[PDB]
Amino acid sequence: KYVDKIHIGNYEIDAWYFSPFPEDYGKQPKLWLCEYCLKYMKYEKSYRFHLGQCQWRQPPGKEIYRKSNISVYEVDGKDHKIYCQNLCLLAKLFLDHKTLYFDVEPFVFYILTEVDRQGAHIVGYFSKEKESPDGNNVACILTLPPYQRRGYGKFLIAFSYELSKLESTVGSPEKPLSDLGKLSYRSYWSWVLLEILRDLSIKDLSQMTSITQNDIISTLQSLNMVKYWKGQHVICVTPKLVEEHLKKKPPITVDSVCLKWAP
Ligand SMILES: [Zn+2]
């Protein structure tokens, strides 16, 4: 038997995939998760007791972004082990290809929250290696199911490249991506590149956006704005073609002004 469903905050969510909740927890049909500290519990009674006792009303670590009622928390895997393990086991219920749950010390986690009077409610996250050999600016990324396809996915994608720009490096998500992941990255890449070309080599676009040359090429390929000549990719842009494509912005965007972060 695997964990079939979770209660988190006011949400009931059915599992998509196996998640190795350890020992007797992994043998429970339903797990009850504190929406703040992400502690996983076996029974409604232990959950209700924890609701009254737990003092956490936000993720741990540093609030590195705040605009209106959207905030992003930076949680270092080394300083907040239990929290980051809890998050990885939650994420694995809804990510097929995530493989790391417990060995979290090498990772930083960026928690997207929407805030009200009660506290900061987890919407989604992405994990990131502190040191990436392959130059991955995102390890795993997820919007929790009840929040999917409402702008939040593209927000965390945007946020990951805002970090990469401040690092003065190029980045690509660790593959494979989910079907949703693939569509959201493509949409984001397109929006960024179209908005620039509306107003420059492929290298220039890579330095401006922190998007890899390969990701830019595949995006310009999908837009039919690149040609191949004697073994070189050539940008073939037409202001009418660019304006026609734009004829969309995500509901919420990352404001660099509201990002308080240094490498
Ligand atoms: Zn708690």
**CATH architecture of the domain with residue range 5-258:** 3-Layer(aba) Sandwich (3.40)
Give the distance from CA 116 to its chain's centroid. Answer: 21
CB atoms within 10 A of CB 200: 11
Which segments are annotated as binding site for Zn(2+)?
A: 34, 37, 50, 54
Domain extents for the chain? 5-258
The structure's method of determination equals X-ray
Classify residue 189 by its DSSP letter. Answer: H
Q: How far is residue 184's CA from residue 256's CA, in Å, rounded to a whole number?
A: 20
Contact 226, 190 (CB under 8 A): no
What is the distance in A from the centroid of ligand 1 to the CA of 40? 9
Helix (H) or strand (E) holding 179: helix 179-198
Alpha-carbon span 142 to 158, nearest angstrom: 13
- Residue 243 catalytic? no
Round to whole Å and give the CA distance between 226 and 10.
48
Ligand 1 center to 59 CA (angstroms): 10
The one catalytic residue in 35, 74, 129, 174 is 174
Q: Please, are residues 15 and 24 in contact by the beta-carbon 8 Å criterion?
A: no
**Backbone gaps in the chain, preceding residues (C–N over 2.5 A):** 199, 247
Picking from 185, 189, 168, 169, the residue whose alpha carbon sits closest to that of residue 177 is 185
Name the residue with tokens 């990701």: 215
Q: What are phi and psi of 217, to 5 degrees?
A: -60, -50
The overall longest dimension of the chain from CA atoms, in Å, is 69
CA of 48 to the centre of ligand 1 (A): 11
Residue found under tokens 């070309």: 197
Q: Rounded to whole angstroms, how far apart are CA atoms 60 and 47? A: 20
The pairing of strands 226-229 and 172-173 is: unpaired
The residues pairing with 244 across neighbouring beta strands, listed in sequence order, are none
Q: What is the DSSP letter of 51?
A: H
Rounded to an integer, what distance in angstroms lies between the CA atom of residue 215 and that of residue 218? 5
- Residue 82 CA to its chain's centroid (Å): 20
Resolution, expressed in angstroms to one decimal? 2.2
**H or E element at residue 47:** helix 44-53
